[PDB]
Paper text:
A monotopic alternative NADH dehydrogenase (Type II NADH dehydrogenase: NDH-2) catalyses the electron transfer from NADH to quinone via FAD or FMN without a proton-pumping activity, and functions as an initial enzyme, either in addition to or as an alternative to proton-pumping NADH dehydrogenase (complex I) in the respiratory chain of bacteria, archaea, and fungal and plant mitochondria. A series of studies has suggested that Ndi1, one of three NDH-2s from Saccharomyces cerevisiae, would be useful in replacement therapy for mitochondrial diseases caused by complex I dysfunction. We reported that the enzymatic reaction of yeast Ndi1 has a ping-pong mechanism, as is the case with NDH-2s from Mycobacterium tuberculosis and Yarrowia lipolytica. In this reaction mechanism, two substrates—NADH and ubiquinone—bind to the enzyme sequentially, but not at the same time.
A Lineweaver-Burk plot analyses indicated that stigmatellin is a competitive inhibitor whereas the others are mixed-type. There are no significant differences between the structures of the complexes, as indicated by root-mean-square deviations of 0.58–0.76 Å, which were calculated for 454–462 superimposed Cα positions.
Numbering used by the authors:
A (entry chain A): 29 to 146, 164 to 419, 425 to 513
B (entry chain B): 28 to 146, 164 to 420, 425 to 513
Write the structure that this text describes.
C-alpha cells in the first residue's frame, strides 16, 4: 500500500485499522472475485489474518440471473456488486490487487500476476484458488469465431448487440425472403439450465415484448435448443425433464436432443443427431445468433500449475483436492469451486458450501501451536479433528420462459419439494432473491422485475 | 419513396395501425427529430387525417432536464430515454420512423434527403415539421472539440463518467503529494445555466456523498471549478436566487469563476481570461482532469444549408426565421420548432413543447378546411383567410438543481407568479415536478426507482456500463 505495483487501477486496499509494518498475522491470497472467493471473503476472519484478492474482475457476478440480462429482463447493474462493498463490510484490512493471475509459484511461494493495466510475484502464506473455469468448445471449429459464450457481463452485452442488429437487418427484407428468416434464427448450444434459461428468456422476449412493436418478425423468429444428451437438465430427474422440454416446445422452442455440433460455419452450423434406432443423421441449422452455453475446462494458470506440482501431473478437469479442500500435492494451497476437481458438480451451490466450510475450517485453525511455523500435508488437520467437507445438496432450479419453472429442493436426501408450474416459478423468483449476496443487487433485481411486470423490457443495443 | 425495401436507417419500422391505401389518402407530414419538438408533436397530432414519417438518427427521445444526473448515475442512462416506437404504439393511425439523419433540405423540389450511418436516398413531404435541434457551441474556442465533453446526448454522458472514472483510477495510484494526481482530480464545467450548474452539482454529490465512502483520501483533493463569462450564474432568475445559487454552490466546496471567459483549452489545462467590473483583463490558467462544456447552442448544417436554398433566411443567425404560425419566413409547406427555429424565444425545452403542441392544435383545424385539399399566392394567406390565431408563449416556469441536497425554482404562469424560493423544501418539489413533466410512465418509475434505490445506497459508477 502507498507504493507502485504490476496490477490494474482498481487496485485498492481498505484502511480500516492499521498494520504493524513488520507483521505476523498470516496473509491469505484469494484468487477470483466470484462465487467461491467472494463467499470465502464473507466467512473469513479479517482480524486473525490479513487478506489480498486477485481477479481481473472488480465486481462479483450473480451468475444464476446472468442469462436474463441479455433481453433486459434484468440490467447488468442489477446482478453484480463490486468486491469493495464486500471488503468494506469486512472487519480487518483487505486488498484487491485489481489484476489477473498468470502463474502460481508453489515452490517459490508467490503467485505471479499481470494486469491488462500494468515480472510481478505476490506473497502468500496460504492460497485460496477460486478463479473458476472457462467454457468448453471441445475444439469444435468456428465456435470461438462465431460464437457467444454466456459467462460474464460482456457476453450479456455482446449477445444483445448481435441479436438486435440481426432483428434490424432482418426487418428490412420481406417475409418471403429466407435470409431474413435465417437472421431470425437463434441456436443455443447446451441444454443444461443456463442454455435452457437463455433459450427461454429469449422466448419470454420475442413473445411478451417484441411481438407488440413488430409481430411480422416475432412470428418468423426461430429459437433452437441443442443438446448432446437424451434430455435437458439431466441434473433434474426425468419426470420434470420431460415437462420442461414439452413446455419449451409449448413456448415454441425447437429442441434438438441427442445432437452434437460438429462444426460452426458463419451462417449455419453443422449438427449430427444420434438416434434411438442406432443411426447418426446429419442436419444443418442456420442461425443469426449462436449462444454456446456448454461445458467447462479449467483456465491455463490452473492447468499450468498441474505441471509445477507432481501429484497434480494428471489433474484432468482442475486442481485435485483432499477433503479439507486443499491441493493434493501442496499444503498452503486450497482450490474451491470450479478450478477445483473434486468429483462434484461445478456449480454455485457446491462452491458456496466449499467456501463456508473453509472459512470455519480456517477460522477454526486460529487456536493451534504447530500452525505458528513452517512433510505430509493433511495429517495436521486430521489430528485436531476438524471435520472433512461434506456436501449437503439442496436441489436445482430452472426458468422456462413464459412464466413457469421446474424446481426441486432437498436437504440431505429429504426432498422438501419438487414441482414445476406457475406456483414454482413464483417460488423460483423468491428463492433466487433469497440466495443473492448484496442488498443493492437484490433491490435493483427486485425493481427490474417489478418494472417489467407493469412495463416491457429494456432492449437497447446502445446500453 | 414508399413500398417496402430500402438501405439507410436500420430502425425504420412501421406501425400497421389500420390498412394503407397505396394511391394514398392523407397529406404526408415529415418530422425531423426525436427530441422535445418532434415528440411533443407526436403526442397530440391526428394520424387519421395525416400520415406521419419521423426522421431521426436517434430512435429514443431524450429527457433532457435529467441528463446531467446520469454521468454519476443518480439516474441510470436508460431511465431517461424512450424509444420512439412506444409513442407510435399510442398513436391511432400509421407512423413510420427511419433510423437515418436529414442531410440537406430541398424546398422547391420538396424533398429531405437522408444518409443513415448504416445503409436516390430522398424523401417526399406534403408538410415538414423541422425539429432537429441545435448543437453545442465552441465559439471557435480551441480544442474543446478535442479535449472537451459536451453534455447533450446519452453518449456525452457515458463518456464523462469513463473519463472522470478513469481519472479517479490513475490518480489513486499517486503519492498524495503529487500535484498531478491533484489535477487529474480537478473538474471544470463551463457554463452557468442550469445544465452546467446541475452537472457541477451532481458531480460533487457523488464525490461528497458517494466517493469518500470508500476512497475518502481522494475526495479531499478533488476540485470542481465552474467557469462563466457572465456576472452571476443562472442569469434567468431574480438576483436573490442566482446569488443564493452561487452561495450554496460554494457551500458544497465548489470553486466558482464568474465573469470568466475560456480562451483556449490545452490538454491538461485551459487558458481562462477573467475580466473585472473595474475593467481589468486578468488571466488564469486552470488545470483540469475532466472538462464539461455546458455552453452554447449554434445550429446544424441541414438548418444552415437551408438558409441558402431560400432567400428570407440568409442573414438569419440563430436558426430558421418563423412567422407567427411557425412556418418558415420564405417557404410554405415547411414549419420549424424548438431549438432549430429562430423564435425570439428561449432556446429551451419548455418553449419547444408548446411550440409543437400549438402546431398540433393548428394541424387539427386545417384538416377540416378545403384549401388544404389542394397542395397535394403566399404562405400565411390561408392562415389569415381562416382566422388562425398566431403562436404566443406562456412562460410557465424555471428550475434548477445544485447543492449536495438543495435546489430552487419558479413556477409562475402568465405574469402572475406562483411559488419561488430555495432549500430542501424546494428540493422535494423539483423531483415531483420533473417526474410530472416526464413523457412516459415507464421512464417516471425507472427514475423513481432510481431515487428510491439511491436513498438506501450509493449510485453506481461503473465505467464500462
Ligand atoms: C449463466 C450462468 C448461470 C448459472 N446458474 C446457476 C444456478 O442457477 N445454479 C447453480 O447452482 N449454478 C449455476 N451456475 C454455475 C455456477 O455459477 C458456477 O459453477 C460458479 O460461478 C463457480 O464459482 P467460482 O467461484 O468457481 O468461479 P466464478 O464464480 O465463475 O468466479 C471466478 C472468479 O475468478 C476470476 N478469475 C478468472 N480467472 C482468473 C485469473 N486467472 N486470475 C484471477 N482471477 C480470475 C473471475 O473473473 C471471477 O472473479 C451458473 C453459471 C453460469 C455461467
Ligand atoms: C442537460 C440538459 C438539461 C436541460 N434542461 C432543460 C430544462 O430543465 N428546461 C428546459 O426548458 N430546457 C432544458 N434543456 C434544453 C432543451 O433540451 C432543448 O432546448 C430542447 O431539447 C430543444 O428541443 P428540440 O426538439 O428543439 O431539439 P432536441 O430536443 O435536441 O431534438 C432534436 C432531435 O433531432 C434529432 N436530430 C439531430 N440532427 C438530426 C438530423 N439531421 N436529422 C434528423 N434528426 C436529427 C436529435 O437526436 C433529436 O431527437 C436542457 C438541455 C440539456 C442539454
Ligand atoms: C438462502 C437460501 C440458500 C442459500 C444458498 C445455498 C447454495 C446455493 C445457492 C444458489 O444460488 C443455488 C441456485 C440454484 C440451485 C442451488 C443453489 N444452492 O445450493
Ligand atoms: C403537467 C406538468 C406540467 C407541464 C408543463 C410543461 C411546460 C414546461 C416544460 C419543461 O420541459 C420545463 C423545464 C424546466 C422548467 C419548466 C418547464 N415547463 O414549465
Ligand atoms: Mg471465484
Ligand atoms: Mg461470479
Ligand atoms: Mg467459475
Ligand atoms: Mg472457482
Ligand atoms: Mg431532446
Ligand atoms: Mg426535436
Ligand atoms: Mg436540441
Ligand atoms: Mg429542435
Amino acid at each position: 500500500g502507498v507504493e507502485n505495483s504490476g496490477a490494474g487501477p482498481t487496485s485498492f486496499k481498505t484502511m480500516k485499522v492499521i498494520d504493524p509494518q513488520h507483521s505476523d498475522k498470516p496473509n491469505v491470497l484469494i484468487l477470483g472475485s466470484g462465487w467461491g472467493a467472494i463467499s470465502f471473503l464473507k466467512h473469513i476472519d479479517t482480524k486473525k489474518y490479513n487478506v489480498s484478492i486477485i481477479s481481473p474482475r472488480s465486481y462479483f457476478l450473480f451468475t444464476p440471473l446472468l442469462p436474463s440480462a441479455p433481453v433486459g429482463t434484468v440490467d447488468e447493474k442489477s446482478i453484480i456488486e463490486p468486491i469493495v462493498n464486500f471488503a468494506l463490510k469486512k472487519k480487518g484490512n483487505v486488498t484487491y490487487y485489481e489484476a489477473e493471475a498468470t502463474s502460481i509459484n508453489p515452490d517459490r511461494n508467490t503467485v505471479t500476476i499481470k494486469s491488462l493495466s500494468a515480472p510481478a510475484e505476490i506473497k502468500y502464506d496460504y492460497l485460496i484458488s477460486a478463479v473458476g473455469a472457462e467454457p468448453n468448445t471441445f475444439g469444435i471449429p468456428g465456435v470461438t469465431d462465431y460464437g457467444h459464450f454466456l459467462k460474464e457481463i460482456p457476453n450479456s452485452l455482446e449477445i444483445r448487440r448481435t441479436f438486435a442488429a440481426n432483428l434490424e437487418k432482418a426487418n428490412l427484407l420481406p417475409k418471403g425472403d429466407p435470409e431474413r428468416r435465417r437472421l431470425l434464427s437463434i441456436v443455443v448450444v447446451g441444454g443444461g439450465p443456463t442454455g435452457v434459461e437463455a433459450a427461454g428468456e429469449l422466448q419470454d422476449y420475442v413473445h411478451q415484448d417484441l411481438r407488440k412493436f413488430l409481430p411480422a418478425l416475432a412470428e418468423e423468429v426461430q429459437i433452437h435448443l441443442v443438446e448432446a444428451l437424451p434430455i435437458v437438465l439431466n441434473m433434474f430427474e426425468k419426470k420434470l425433464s420431460s415437462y420442461a422440454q414439452s413446455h419449451l416446445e409449448n413456448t415454441s422452442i425447437k429442441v434438438h436432443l441427442r445432437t452434437a455440433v460438429a462444426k460452426v460455419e458463419e451462417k449455419q452450423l453443422l449438427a449430427k443427431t444420434k438416434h434411438e434406432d442406432g443411426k447418426i443423421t446429419e442436419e444443418t441449422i442456420p442461425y443469426g445468433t449462436l449462444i454456446w452455453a456448454t461445458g467447462n475446462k479449467a483456465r491455463p494458470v490452473i492447468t499450468d500449475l498441474f505441471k509445477k506440482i507432481p501429484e497434480q501431473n494428471s489433474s484432468k478437469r482442475g486442481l485435485a483436492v483432499n477433503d479439507f479442500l486443499q491441493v493434493k500435492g501442496s499444503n498452503n494451497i486450497f482450490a474451491i469451486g470450479d478450478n477445483a476437481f473434486a468429483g462434484l458438480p461445478p456449480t454455485a451451490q457446491v462452491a458456496h458450501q466449499e467456501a463456508e466450510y473453509l472459512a470455519k475450517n480456517f477460522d477454526k485453525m486460529a487456536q493451534i501451536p504447530n500452525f505458528q511455523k513452517n512433510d505430509k500435508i493433511d495429517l495436521l488437520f486430521e489430528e485436531n479433528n476438524f471435520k472433512p467437507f461434506k456436501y449437503n445438496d439442496l436441489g436445482a432450479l430452472a426458468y422456462l420462459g413464459s412464466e413457469r419453472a421446474i424446481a426441486t429442493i432437498r436437504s440431505g436426501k429429504r426432498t422438501f419439494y419438487t414441482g414445476g408450474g406457475l406456483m414454482t416459478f413464483y417460488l423460483w423468483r423468491i428463492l433466487y432473491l433469497s440466495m443473492i449476496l448484496s442488498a443493492r443487487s437484490r433491490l435493483k433485481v427486485f425493481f427490474d422485475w417489478i418494472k417489467l411486470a407493469f412495463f416491457k423490457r429494456d432492449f437497447f443495443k446502445g446500453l
